[PDB]
Amino acid sequence: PIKVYGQVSLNDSHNQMVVHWAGEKSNVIVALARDSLALARPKSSDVYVSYDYGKSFKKISDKLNFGLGNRSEAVIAQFYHSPADNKRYIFADAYAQYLWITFDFCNTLQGFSIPFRAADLLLHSKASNLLLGFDRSHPNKQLWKSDDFGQTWIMIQEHVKSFSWGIDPYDKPNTIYIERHEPSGYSTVFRSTDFFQSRENQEVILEEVRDFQLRDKYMFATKVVHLLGSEQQSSVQLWVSFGRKPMRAAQFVTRHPINEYYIADASEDQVFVCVSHSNNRTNLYISEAEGLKFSLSLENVLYYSPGGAGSDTLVRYFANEPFADFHRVEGLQGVYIATLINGSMNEENMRSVITFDKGGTWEFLQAPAFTGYGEKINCELSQGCSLHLAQRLSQLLNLQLRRMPILSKESAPGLIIATGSVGKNLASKTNVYISSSAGARWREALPGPHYYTWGDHGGIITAIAQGMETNELKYSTNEGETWKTFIFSEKPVFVYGLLTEPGEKSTVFTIFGSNKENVHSWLILQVNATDALGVPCTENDYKLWSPSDERGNECLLGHKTVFKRRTPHATCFNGEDFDRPVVVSNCSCTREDYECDFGFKMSEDLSLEVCVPDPEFSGKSYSPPVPCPVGSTYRRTRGYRKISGDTCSGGDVEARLEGELVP
Amino acid sequence: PIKVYGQVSLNDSHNQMVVHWAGEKSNVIVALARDSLALARPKSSDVYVSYDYGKSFKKISDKLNFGLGNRSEAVIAQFYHSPADNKRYIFADAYAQYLWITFDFCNTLQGFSIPFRAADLLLHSKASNLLLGFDRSHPNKQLWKSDDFGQTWIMIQEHVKSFSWGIDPYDKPNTIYIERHEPSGYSTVFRSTDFFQSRENQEVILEEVRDFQLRDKYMFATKVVHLLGSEQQSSVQLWVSFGRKPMRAAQFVTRHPINEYYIADASEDQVFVCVSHSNNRTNLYISEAEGLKFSLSLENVLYYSPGGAGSDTLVRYFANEPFADFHRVEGLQGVYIATLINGSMNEENMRSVITFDKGGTWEFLQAPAFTGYGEKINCELSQGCSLHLAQRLSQLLNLQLRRMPILSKESAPGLIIATGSVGKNLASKTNVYISSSAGARWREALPGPHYYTWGDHGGIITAIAQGMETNELKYSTNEGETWKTFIFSEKPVFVYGLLTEPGEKSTVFTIFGSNKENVHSWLILQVNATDALGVPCTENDYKLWSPSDERGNECLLGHKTVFKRRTPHATCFNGEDFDRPVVVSNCSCTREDYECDFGFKMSEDLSLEVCVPDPEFSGKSYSPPVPCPVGSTYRRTRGYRKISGDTCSGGDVEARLEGELVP
């Protein structure tokens, strides 16, 4: 049912491999087995390329030469891939000021040379020609702007600590935000659309900022205040804006002065800020579309903050290690898996929680109320053993490739393959707890830590056991109900990662493992699994889901959504191409069905959706409780009225917002 | 996957085995491997039994002995199983007057002795005790009745040509019919509710009669009219009854005189005679629920008449070889697969046809189009295509090429597995053509003649290959779209039959092999296939299916029926209990059903299309020459009435427009 069609052997001994899958309709894989980690300067590096979907790999490091007159063998630190063009690549060097380059899938490499050392290059996301370049090691920090993709570099600014491009909608192209060093260690943010050449096309946003950040629609800055300016207590303030309007302030009224701010997730026209290090009590805070109406949402939360350069408050994080255990279920608006804490730096207490409506009600994770292979183990005690999922912090112990994180992708909605344990904490002796209903109902798929992933839009899950030599591939199509097994080799071989092409559609799985001998000998196996799914799907294999709730019904938030997802047991190719919420369900008895009360005029602005009486009434519509609409403990709205036949039930929008009983 | 859990070896050499599967919750199987058949002189016989569904078989012929003082070895010709108690069995002997009985799954066998030779027995169907007997070899044609299940026999009648019991309704219990002999060869018929003991409880149904037959509600008799009574050739006439009313006549008025009549189906208050055999033809004829308005429905059907005793017209036949090629799709009311022929014999003209409404239309069977045996795109025949199916002729027996009949069962409706393709003249030479839509849409599942069957309500099909020795089990779950393969042995073995428990719900399959072809060495395998279906099914995996005709306007016959059956691609246990069409939808007795009758016509304004009486009749429509006298509860109509043989139960338009029994 499952066949292997590629077994490559690489005679290298490097301890790290970065793999890039090039394009959609092209079959090109570029691997770079570099050395050590992001700790010191490498000693060797190799580059392999494949033009038939990883079937065979050919070393291509021989082309990367310093040209005639130099026999030195170069070492490549990183390679960059142009977002707006999959045919263009860039290879840097970690010892000499020199950049390689190609224009057609790494087939032909040129030998261009550059000023400065290639540390960070921010390739433009819509124009392949335009690049930036930075050199952090320089004592006089500089910034360079290339337009020929590597030939000319030019100087555009000096003494720069951070920089970023501009996201398409709310600013003009060629816009570059920049931060600037100051004598007293501070900063200042500048915006321009002409590459810093004229003062007529340069604007200043905010000064003396301690840390700056740009995320889609929002704009965040943190700055120090009095006891540095006038008196009292230095309590860092967070200034947020929206639509690239001038930077307003934010009110966080609490007894304990704040000293830290961490943006967790801030693009739903919403935001979840982990705001504290005050007396070691980090409380999650949510606001709404205004931008500054921040209110408490969850006491504690395990927040990790070593600090910065001695005064840095707001923290920027890469993909290697997060500073906060907080996971948004990707592809869905509202589900969020936090983890509470009561210790200081320990690891045992990891009580997890979950919501389903934008962090309004923080529940506890459910349990399977069953067990694989057939059992009846469980518990509840309303305090006893709720599922406790494994986030990414504390590294557990110095183990090898362990603690796979909560897996969730936009391609297959409502499917969450996590690793956890049932009890009062996380401990050890973990398990894999698949869920196919956006985390509302769990399962007990596989006993023991595994290497899980999925292909074909979550159509076929797969998993390999970690810890010991193994050759068993446990592929499934039931979404964890029944697991088959396939043998991909003849002799057991350590596996250091099960990977597939980013995104989906790709049934072909890739295994990175080192056969039995001096590590390593990076092997690469390509396990096709197309034949295990059967045949084209058909209109009665699909159906319609809509985020299924915990408390109960998928009923809430303001509108609704409805995806077409294949039915659990079916066994048919979801296709390799498609999907959609063809309707957004503009409302089910809600925002977009509401009104006022007739005669009462509506507002001119289209973003309000609110109803007014009429200024021509000279304010005579405010009367004592003589008439019907007011009197005693009367019920208050904003003009809204529920039209007959609108039988809805449950939802954060209607709750705590409409029809308040006030005397 | 699959699991074999039985490899029983039987050290016999007999050439036939008649297996009986006992009970529902009992795991008893009783084999009677016997010799020859169609020889009337058995030489040896053996018996077997298995109380563990077939794990092992214990020979039990040693307990069948003639008692002490007799060393003669008994040979068993047949065994009978009472259809009102699965614990009671009867054996018999073909050389000596002797019977063997039991009362608990063949565990304890008695040795009761009887008069006469146990040729034929007719065990009752609602009372285990009461039982009949017969001995055709006896010159006097003598008849015996037992009411102790083997002990007492007494005398009820003599000179008995044929006999039959009475079906549960339309006549009282123990209401035996009888068809005796005459000095001048005719039969007559007598009905008795008191076992031929008193002349006051004996009734004469009809005199003379060349042949008599009883089928549920109907009752057919073929009478030769006067030998030399009037100056014309004597023509055989058919007399039909209904509700056991006195025998009326029937008119098949045609130019050509008839000479025989063969009932083909009469179990759906309709009859498909196969008459004429009118000197050179056959011509299925159809009638209504009344039974005296027979009308031509298809011509030259293929009907085989080997003859009888020299003057007999109707001969009762066993399941070995039937008289006509005509197959009702079991479980569905309306679908019938005939087979027409132009002139002699021998697969030269075998154009199959099909009907979807009680012998109303006759199509030619649609070809698969995508001839997917080589996974090709070969678009079969054009300008009028035809798929030809095997039938009950199959060039006699003992030949291997079409030695499998059209398979349809009541358990899984709309699933047909037939064998054919070569048909008329064009060479395709046998295949397997599965259909899952009541024969409207065909498929081309497997290439080459096979040994097909299904289990779990049609959930899992399976097939062995006939011909050379093989050990490949090609099971399937998506109704023949994709076939797997399992190996049930280590060396190829010749298989003579792939069998399963009569009915369905049994995933366990049985194979009857004989290892090496050195005489017979009967082998019995037991291939459990429960694990190939995965897990319990669920409400998502069903639908509502109704018989889909070729044109697609599936609303026929004035009423509907919907079955809740699993979807093709789904892979889950189809359950084991309760498939049922809970609703017989009458739709809404519409306008297609109705129409103007004789003497009725359109009104001045079409509009409602009311059937107004024709004024041209001059007011003679109220004449006493009508079959409906006035008085009592009279039939009142406004111009519409329901056509006989149709039953509309549902619809507001139907009410108060058709004939009503007004008191």
Give me the DSSP letters along A587-630: -SSSGGG----SSSPBPS-TTT--B---GGGTTTT---S-SSSS
CB B136 within 8 A of CB B162: no
Q: What is the DSSP letter of B85?
A: -
CA-nearest of B398, B407, B401, B475 to B436 is B407
Q: Is A373 on the interface with B (CB under 8 A)?
A: no
Q: Which residues contact B155 (CB under 8 A, 6 or more apart)?
A: B142, B143, B144
Q: Is A569 on the interface with B (CB under 8 A)?
A: yes
Q: Is the previous residue joined to B138 through a cis bond, with omega within 30 degrees of 0?
A: no
Interstrand relation of A28-33 and A218-223 (parallel, antiparallel or unpaired): unpaired
CB contact under 8 A, A538 and B569: yes
Q: Is A535 on the interface with B (CB under 8 A)?
A: yes
CB contact under 8 A, B538 and A478: no
The C-alpha of A17 sits at a distance from chain B's nearest C-alpha, in angstroms, of: 38
Interstrand relation of B3-9 and A660-662 (parallel, antiparallel or unpaired): unpaired
Q: Is B567 on the interface with A (CB under 8 A)?
A: yes
Q: Is A3 on the interface with B (CB under 8 A)?
A: no
C-alpha distances out from residue A156 to A20, A150, A194, A209, B653, Å? 31, 16, 10, 22, 85
Chain A contacts in chain B segment 460-479 (CB below 8 A):
478
Q: What is the DSSP string of A340-367?
A: ---SSS-SS---B-BBSSTTS--B----
CA of residue A588 relative to chain centroid, distance: 30
Q: Which residues contact A515 (CB under 8 A, 6 or more apart)?
A: A491, A493, A521, A523
CB contact under 8 A, B572 and A571: no
Q: HEC states along A156-167?
A: EEECEEEEECCC
Helix (H) or strand (E) holding A582: none
Size of interface A-B (CB pairs under 8 A): 46
Q: In whole angstroms, what is the distance from residue B7 CA to residue B2 CA? A: 15
Beta partners for residue A614, in sequence order: none
Q: What is the DSSP string of B32-64?
A: --B--SSSS-------EEBTTTTS--EE-GGG-
Q: In whole angstroms, what is the distance from residue B130 CA to residue A45 CA? A: 94
CB contact under 8 A, B538 and A482: no
CA-nearest of A281, A245, A240, A275 to A260 is A275
The C-alpha of B465 sits at a distance from chain A's nearest C-alpha, in angstroms, of: 22
CB B143 within 8 A of CB B136: no
C-alpha distances out from residue B618 to B453, B604, B623, Å? 65, 18, 11
The C-alpha of A52 sits at a distance from chain B's nearest C-alpha, in angstroms, of: 26
CB A384 within 8 A of CB A424: yes
Whether the CA torsion A485, A489, A493, A494 is positive or negative: it is negative
CB contact under 8 A, A567 and B478: no
Q: In whole angstroms, what is the distance from residue B15 CA to residue B483 CA? A: 32
Phi, psi of B61 (to 5 degrees): -70, -15
Phi, psi of A108 (to 5 degrees): -125, 120
The C-alpha of B248 sits at a distance from chain A's nearest C-alpha, in angstroms, of: 53
Which residue among A534, A541, A569 places its CB closest to the CB of B572?
A569
Q: Is B534 on the interface with A (CB under 8 A)?
A: yes
Q: In whole angstroms, what is the distance from residue A622 CA to residue B411 CA? A: 75
Sheet containing B120-123: order of strands: B120-123, B131-134, B143-146
Q: Name the method of structure determination.
A: cryo-EM
Q: Is B483 on the interface with A (CB under 8 A)?
A: no
CB B40 within 8 A of CB B32: no
CB A99 within 8 A of CB A120: no
Q: In whole angstroms, what is the distance from residue B454 CA to residue B332 CA? A: 18
Q: Is A572 on the interface with B (CB under 8 A)?
A: yes
Q: Which residue has the tokens 């001695």?
A: A310
Q: Which two tokens stand for residue A626?
A: 């003589």
CA-nearest of A335, A432, A351, A334 to A386 is A351
Q: Is A441 on the interface with B (CB under 8 A)?
A: no
Q: In whole angstroms, what is the distance from residue A222 CA to residue A243 CA? A: 18
Q: In whole angstroms, what is the distance from residue B269 CA to residue B256 CA? A: 28
Which residue among B482, B543, B571 places its CB closest to the CB of A540?
B543
Q: What is the DSSP letter of A498?
A: E
Q: Which residues contact A527 (CB under 8 A, 6 or more apart)?
A: A2, A3, A4, A473, A486, A488, A508, A509, A510, A511
Q: In whole angstroms, what is the distance from residue B404 CA to residue B452 CA? A: 8
End-to-end CA distance of chain A: 71
Q: Which residues contact B236 (CB under 8 A, 6 or more apart)?
A: B210, B222, B223, B224, B225, B258, B259, B260, B261, B313
Which residues on A lie below 8 Å from B543 (Cβ)? 540
C-alpha distances out from residue B536 to A460, A481, A482, B576, Å? 20, 11, 11, 10
CB contact under 8 A, B482 and A569: no
The C-alpha of B569 sits at a distance from chain A's nearest C-alpha, in angstroms, of: 6
Burial zone of A243 (CB within 10 Å; 0-12 exposed, 13-18 middle, 19+ buried): exposed
CA dihedral angle for residue B150, residue B155, residue B157, residue B160, rounded to 10 degrees: 40
Put residue A646 in one of left, alpha, beta given phi > 0 → left and psi -120 to 50 → alpha: beta
CA of residue B89 relative to chain centroid, distance: 24
Mutation choice for B interface testing from A460, A567, A569 by most B CBs within 10 A: A569
Q: In whole angstroms, what is the distance from residue B115 CA to residue B503 CA? A: 36
Q: Which two tokens stand for residue B376?
A: 């090709």
Which residues on A lie below 8 Å from B537 (Cβ)? 569
Q: What is the DSSP letter of B374?
A: T
Q: Which two tokens stand for residue A498?
A: 């099960």
Q: What is the DSSP string of B402-449?
A: S-SPPB--SSSTT-EEEEBS--SSS----EEEEESSTTSS----EES-
CA of residue A144 relative to chain centroid, distance: 29
Q: Which residues contact B222 (CB under 8 A, 6 or more apart)?
A: B209, B210, B211, B212, B236, B237, B238, B239, B260, B261, B313, B314
Q: Which residues contact A246 (CB under 8 A, 6 or more apart)?
A: A205
Q: Which residues contact B378 (CB under 8 A, 6 or more apart)?
A: B371
Q: Which two tokens stand for residue B242?
A: 């209904």
Q: Is B538 on the interface with A (CB under 8 A)?
A: yes
Which residue among A478, A481, A567 places its CB closest to the CB of B541?
A567
Amino acid at A595: E
CB contact under 8 A, B538 and A572: no
Q: In whole angstroms, what is the distance from residue B117 CA to residue B481 CA? A: 53
End-to-end CA distance of chain B: 67
The C-alpha of B98 sits at a distance from chain A's nearest C-alpha, in angstroms, of: 55
Whether the CA torsion A619, A623, A628, A630 is positive or negative: it is positive
Q: In whole angstroms, what is the distance from residue A69 CA to residue A449 CA? A: 53
C-alpha distances out from residue A353 to A285, A391, A434, Å? 15, 12, 17
CB B621 within 8 A of CB B611: no
Which residue among A478, A481, A570 places its CB closest to the CB of B569?
A570
CB contact under 8 A, A535 and B478: yes
C-alpha distances out from residue A216 to A164, A169, A192, A267, A503, Å? 12, 9, 18, 7, 22
Q: What is the DSSP string of B299-324?
A: SSB-B-----SSS-------SSS-SB
C-alpha distances out from residue B598 to A162, A478, B602, B640, B641, Å? 97, 63, 12, 11, 12
- As a 3-state breakdown, chain B gives helix, strand, coil percent values, each rounded to 5, of 0, 25, 70
CB contact under 8 A, A543 and B540: yes
Which residue among A481, A535, A570 places its CB closest to the CB of B570?
A570
Three-state DSSP at A50 gives strand
Which residue among A482, A571, A572 places its CB closest to the CB of B535?
A482
Three-state DSSP at A279 gives helix
Beta partners for residue A295, in sequence order: A286
Q: What is the DSSP string of A355-419?
A: BSSTTS--B-----SS-TTT------TTTS--EEE--S-S-SSS-SS--PPPB--SSSTT--BEE
CA-nearest of A94, A96, A101, A98 to A119 is A94
The C-alpha of A407 sits at a distance from chain B's nearest C-alpha, in angstroms, of: 26
CB contact under 8 A, A535 and B567: no
